[PDB]
Amino acid sequence: MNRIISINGPLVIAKGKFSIFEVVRVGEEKLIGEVIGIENDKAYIQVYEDTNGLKVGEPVFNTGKPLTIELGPGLLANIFDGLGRPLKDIYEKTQSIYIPKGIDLPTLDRKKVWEFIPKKKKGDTIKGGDIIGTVNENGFEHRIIVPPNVEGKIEEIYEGNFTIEETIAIVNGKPIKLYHEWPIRKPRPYKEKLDYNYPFITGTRVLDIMFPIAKGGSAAVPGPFGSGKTVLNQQIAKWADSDIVIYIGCGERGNEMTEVLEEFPKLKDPKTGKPLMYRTILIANTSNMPIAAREASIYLGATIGEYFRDQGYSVVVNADSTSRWAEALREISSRLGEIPSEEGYPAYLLRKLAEFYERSGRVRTLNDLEGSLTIIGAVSPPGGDFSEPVTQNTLRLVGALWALDSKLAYKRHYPAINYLISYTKQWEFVKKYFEELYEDVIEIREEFFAILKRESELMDIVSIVGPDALSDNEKIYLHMGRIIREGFLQQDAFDENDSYSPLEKTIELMRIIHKYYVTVKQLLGKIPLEEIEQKGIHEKIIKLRYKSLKEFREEIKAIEQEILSLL
Amino acid sequence: PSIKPPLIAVELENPMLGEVIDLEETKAIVIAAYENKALALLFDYYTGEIKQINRQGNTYKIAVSEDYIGGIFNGFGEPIKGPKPYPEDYRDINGLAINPYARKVPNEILYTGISSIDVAHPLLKGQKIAIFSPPGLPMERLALQIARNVAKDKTIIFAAIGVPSDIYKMFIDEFINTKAIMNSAIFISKADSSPIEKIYTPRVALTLAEYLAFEKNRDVLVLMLDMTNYADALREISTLRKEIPSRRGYPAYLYTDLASIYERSGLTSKGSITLIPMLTMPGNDITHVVPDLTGYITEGQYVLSQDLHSKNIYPPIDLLKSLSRLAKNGMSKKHKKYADILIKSYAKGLEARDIATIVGEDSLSKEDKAYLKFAELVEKEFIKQDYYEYRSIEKSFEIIDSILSQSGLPYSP
Amino acid sequence: PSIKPPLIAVELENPMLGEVIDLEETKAIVIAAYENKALALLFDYYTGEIKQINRQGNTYKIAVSEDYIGGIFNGFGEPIKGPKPYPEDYRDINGLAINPYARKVPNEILYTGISSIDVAHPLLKGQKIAIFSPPGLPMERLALQIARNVAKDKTIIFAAIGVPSDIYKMFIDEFINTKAIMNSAIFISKADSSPIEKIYTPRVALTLAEYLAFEKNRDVLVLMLDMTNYADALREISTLRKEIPSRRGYPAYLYTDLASIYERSGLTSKGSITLIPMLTMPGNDITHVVPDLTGYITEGQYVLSQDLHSKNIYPPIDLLKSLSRLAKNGMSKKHKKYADILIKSYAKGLEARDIATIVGEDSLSKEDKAYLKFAELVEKEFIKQDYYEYRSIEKSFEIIDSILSQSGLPYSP
Ligand SMILES: Nc1ncnc2c1ncn2[C@@H]1O[C@H](COP(=O)(O)OP(=O)(O)NP(=O)(O)O)[C@@H](O)[C@H]1O
Numbered sequence A: 001m002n003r004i005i006s007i008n009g010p011l012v013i014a015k016g017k018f019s020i021f022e023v024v025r026v027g028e029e030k031l032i033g034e035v036i037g038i039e040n041d042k043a044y045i046q047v048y049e050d051t052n053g054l055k056v057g058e059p060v061f062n063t064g065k066p067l068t069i070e071l072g073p074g075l076l077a078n079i080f081d082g083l084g085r086p087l088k089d090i091y092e093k094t095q096s097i098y099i100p101k102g103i104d105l106p107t108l109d110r111k112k113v114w115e116f117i118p119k120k121k122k123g124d125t126i127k128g129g130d131i132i133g134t135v136n137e138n139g140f141e142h143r144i145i146v147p148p149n150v151e152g153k154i155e156e157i158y159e160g161n162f163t164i165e166e167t168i169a170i171v172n173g174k175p176i177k178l179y180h181e182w183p184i185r186k187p188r189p190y191k192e193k194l195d196y197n198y199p200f201i202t203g204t205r206v207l208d209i210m211f212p213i214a215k216g217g218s219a220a221v222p223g224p225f226g227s228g229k230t231v232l233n234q235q236i237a238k239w240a241d242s243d244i245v246i247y248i249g250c251g252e253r254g255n256e257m258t259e260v261l262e263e264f265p266k267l268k269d270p271k272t273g274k275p276l277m278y279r280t281i282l283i284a285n286t287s288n289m290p291i292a293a294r295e296a297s298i299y300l301g302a303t304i305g306e307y308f309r310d311q312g313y314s315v316v317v318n319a320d321s322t323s324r325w326a327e328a329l330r331e332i333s334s335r336l337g338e339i340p341s342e343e344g345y346p347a348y349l350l351r352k353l354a355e356f357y358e359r360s361g362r363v364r365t366l367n368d369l370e371g372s373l374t375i376i377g378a379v380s381p382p383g384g385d386f387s388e389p390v391t392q393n394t395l396r397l398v399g400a401l402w403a404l405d406s407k408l409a410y411k412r413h414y415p416a417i418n419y420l421i422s423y424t425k426q427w428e429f430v431k432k433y434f435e436e437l438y439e440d441v442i443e444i445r446e447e448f449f450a451i452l453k454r455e456s457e458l459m460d461i462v463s464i465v466g467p468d469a470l471s472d473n474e475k476i477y478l479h480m481g482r483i484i485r486e487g488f489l490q491q492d493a494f495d496e497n498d499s500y501s502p503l504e505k506t507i508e509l510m511r512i513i514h515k516y517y518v519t520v521k522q523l524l525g526k527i528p529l530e531e532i533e534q535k536g537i538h539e540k541i542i543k544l545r546y547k548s549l550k551e552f553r554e555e556i557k558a559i560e561q562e563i564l565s566l567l
Numbered sequence B, C: 001p002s003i004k005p006p007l008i009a010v011e012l013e014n015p016m017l018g019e020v021i022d023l024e025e026t027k028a029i030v031i032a033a034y035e036n037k038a039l040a041l042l043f044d045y046y047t048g049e050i051k052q053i054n055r056q057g058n059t060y061k062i063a064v065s066e067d068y069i070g071g072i073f074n075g076f077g078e079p080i081k082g083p084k085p086y087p088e089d090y091r092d093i094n095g096l097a098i099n100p101y102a103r104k105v106p107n108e109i110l111y112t113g114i115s116s117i118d119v120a121h122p123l124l125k126g127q128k129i130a131i132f133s134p135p136g137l138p139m140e141r142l143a144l145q146i147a148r149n150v151a152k153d154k155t156i157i158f159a160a161i162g163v164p165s166d167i168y169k170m171f172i173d174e175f176i177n178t179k180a181i182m183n184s185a186i187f188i189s190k191a192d193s194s195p196i197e198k199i200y201t202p203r204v205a206l207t208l209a210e211y212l213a214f215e216k217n218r219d220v221l222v223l224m225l226d227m228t229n230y231a232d233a234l235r236e237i238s239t240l241r242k243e244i245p246s247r248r249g250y251p252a253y254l255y256t257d258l259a260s261i262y263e264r265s266g267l268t269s270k271g272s273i274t275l276i277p278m279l280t281m282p283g284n285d286i287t288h289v290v291p292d293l294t295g296y297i298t299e300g301q302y303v304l305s306q307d308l309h310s311k312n313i314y315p316p317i318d319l320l321k322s323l324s325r326l327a328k329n330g331m332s333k334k335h336k337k338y339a340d341i342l343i344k345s346y347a348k349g350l351e352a353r354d355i356a357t358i359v360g361e362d363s364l365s366k367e368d369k370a371y372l373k374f375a376e377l378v379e380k381e382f383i384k385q386d387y388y389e390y391r392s393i394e395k396s397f398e399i400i401d402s403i404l405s406q407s408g409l410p411y412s413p
């Protein structure tokens, strides 16, 4: 007896009996929606589909559970929308390049035949989150963890080939599948939040040395348009030391999701040699797709990230970008007749953002294994003004700020990381890793910061004094700074040898620049800086990052030898 | 009832959002649906009473065919001159979002023959790239010049949004002269038209563009102007409701709405839609909501310089503010090197131009006057180019090698 | 009824403002009372129906005792781990304003062992002084370091307001390591908690603080963070009503509400409450409403410098922006002289640093390079100090006398 009484964009108000977070089928086409408010006999519903063309008298079909996601084999190397519907299957089922209104497809492949290898025997007792067995997912050991709900003794357990709906075990009268459904608005449980322990190693130097976060930490990547947010996130998604990579396309360009689909199968994981796609999951709700599904994609990718975390794996989530989620919330709030807060956004924006980043962390899983969820969030501040609510709210939630500079992007200095404004609040938790394996880089890191800072101060004097009218005790910082910038901080994402920078290459660059630094310092007064610069070297160090692993290591020796001081 | 042009209020049984209703002469679009109440926008100036109302069963749709090619229409797709295209297969003007799985990323350069574009920020087939112009700069001439050189085998679609007679006639007469109007379709919403016509202008143009490129297998070039007039039209409709406004009265969903237009483009296996949205930056402020949001959506932008224009330079394209995101995809190793040497040296030339304000010119580093010379020659020989001058990519390279030689910088010979 | 988390609307006979009402599992606070209508905030996430409602006869009150010491609680004072304190003598969490006649003005210095604090801007017992930090600076480490050295005989109360797990656990684990968690009480409101819990966090902490210090005769040190998160929580509740907003959506009574918290501290004949509110300056703008209003209320502030932090200096305390209003009360004649010579010479050193941008360093007055040297050494030897290094007030004086000597300035020996 349910009836739509109003249609206002992504908001539909309906009459009848509903629940506070119940999924509903809106209209004759049964469009997927979710109740978010109940005022008497009315229900306020956000529709994750296009609401245009909806008639008033149309019905609203009730369902049992809330908004969930299928957690099992069939996620890796695939692309899904905001509701976790397979975009490859959508294309084939419809034979069209466009996305239909209200298509209903199962998330995990129902026909794909997996091989299940049990890790538990008959008569064993099982807890929630226990690994009941494994499934090889194209080279990845997908650990079938039973729901936190499930406990008891194993009455039966099978082995061999099964589909996703077939029972592989029976525990206390109930069948156990290779997958389960979990509410995406509900953080998956774990035993204990663990201390930061290990540095989150990306492929990018500035994010590994200058402003690194710990495994399980979180970071914000804000910047104006064209600054480099997407590319930076994609670079992290490519080379990050992680078991599982989740890239969420939140309200952005379609081509950039396609871009991943074309390049990732071509690339190999440096740590395993395996193709990158087999560890990658793509969530795509582009800018011109249903705006309410932007929010869903955020929670969806988070729940999947927790899922693989609960298997005792390390997971990273890239959200590009979170501002589009904020726009969606702002829109819902408007239609709901809520009073706007700062810059139109609802007053509960900060808490909503918290519901995302607080999901991150290195934890003790229910099966007493160790897993971590690292969340990287891109922010798109209007006009590149960082003082806006979204950016500012985020900075009181995340562990580091990886700020992109409009001035640096203008110079084509990529990544355009502002090394002065950017920070990390997790250096003390990751320095132990470096203090052990590379004791001398702590000094060089401080040295690089000090040089860049001193070069910054000197730029005010230069513009109203003259760059060549300085002393050689000052010009050295402009000299060294340029080497640090063009040689270490900059990293060509679209170069073959430079795109990925392993710690070996990263540390060697630091060591050779430092080795060059102490040489120049003890050569002041004796030899002018002008004469020193004429002997190249500083130009040869800059180009080191463009050379291969073999070409690089030998050129280092050449530079070390070319440094002879005594002349 | 209730009526104040171009808005009317009336009672309907079960109102449909976006429903087309008929009066005596004109039509209307329902933009708000409460219970029995509804708000509708008139198609044009209507004097009569809002008595008898005929409700069409659906939202606004247009019949698609190749008949639009060679014709001039209004914002509703209706023929101005004459005389109705084949009324077959009606399509919702909003269309559908393209599955990114079904997409192919643009990798083929559409050479414009314009040095300031082709070298550093080339346009690719299926790419959406915008033009940012301060008030009074030859933005229209630039787009027209582009359309000549990149759409000789393609169908051109021009969506005129609220632009004065001076503007759209300039396009028409120029498509006529170059004989390219027979292979083109033009959709025009006058500055005094209903706001519902203005916002429908890009939608009907793209609905045809999607038909020609993805149902028929054609390469389409779509141009639209002015996107700032579009936002004004959208804000007018946004205001007519109870909608809570963002900054400057603009609707809070401006990004998504703009994205619902800019994203209707791209490359597939069958065809392609190359889209060039054009907008006037209010007060020459690129941080204004319209150019800002557009830059957050388009795959790059060509920024017109108020300074270069004062130097009598056409096209007044800012090499450093401009960007083509997908440019790298279609560039060769030699092409990438030339763009690199062009950008970094010109940028360094501008840096040397800034310090020339400090220590006088001729009283600086003898490489800083080299980059200074480089920047000047780039503006006066590379960037500066006649409206009727076409340059091959090799020609543009030669100019660079020439300039590099004159400036005492390393050149390839 | 009506329900959208964490807000509900319902009918009540004679609604009481601030009244606690009971549902099935969770409670609620009435924040608005018309005639028969009332608006209430849920204590947490509630899914059930708003059917049966049990109305407690009073507003939210907590039972006070010394049982809170050693325990960890939420924003409502409820025990997280376990396991309920002695439910005796309930107190309104808002408390009462202290009669200024019954007050004693703070005159005793609590030495922190931190040179950048103790010398020029010392903290006094019963004083309320805040920490202003730009995003990303070691604000939490500074407060923790302070708490070690000034609260060895005092009870520490930590009110965590909306801070991430990383933040409050940092405090807990640090109170555990230094064995100071057995002599402390911790109140925590998670970032996802109800806004009513967040604003109650400092109130329940101070209600206990007032009990321990003014009913029992103890010296209490209260720390709270983040006050910027508090304002956000208060604005969320302010928005849920019909309340007309001030700038940035913040309630117009933000000063008074903040004052209702900061003023709940001071010195009497029986005990004292030393309060250190901590806040993140949005966009590093001290003129933002939260740091501005806080500075209009607290008796000084320690301002963290984004510049000093870039110089790898901890603690990044700005000597000139920072202030301790009641500092003069506890300073001796020798102490006053050292603060004076420190402030005026460092300030003069910064002035000489500014003109060093004009006329180059080494090309200026031969007293201006002295103050320049002074400022540098102050930052690198006086201000800069290890997180585990404690300095006596004499030690800090010696450093000054040392720096003065190295800089060629008059020193006392
Ligand atoms: N590491 C890099 N190496 C080379 N080019 C880069 C690098 N990073 C960014 N770029 C360039 O920066 C330009 C803009 O990148 P992009 O990430 O799309 O900017 P953005 O607007 O900040 N992010 P988004 O809006 O989400 O696409 C691209 O054209 C890239 O070529």
Ligand SMILES: [Mg+2]
Pocket (backbone or CB within 6 Å): A230, A252, A253, A256
């Ligand atoms: Mg993008």
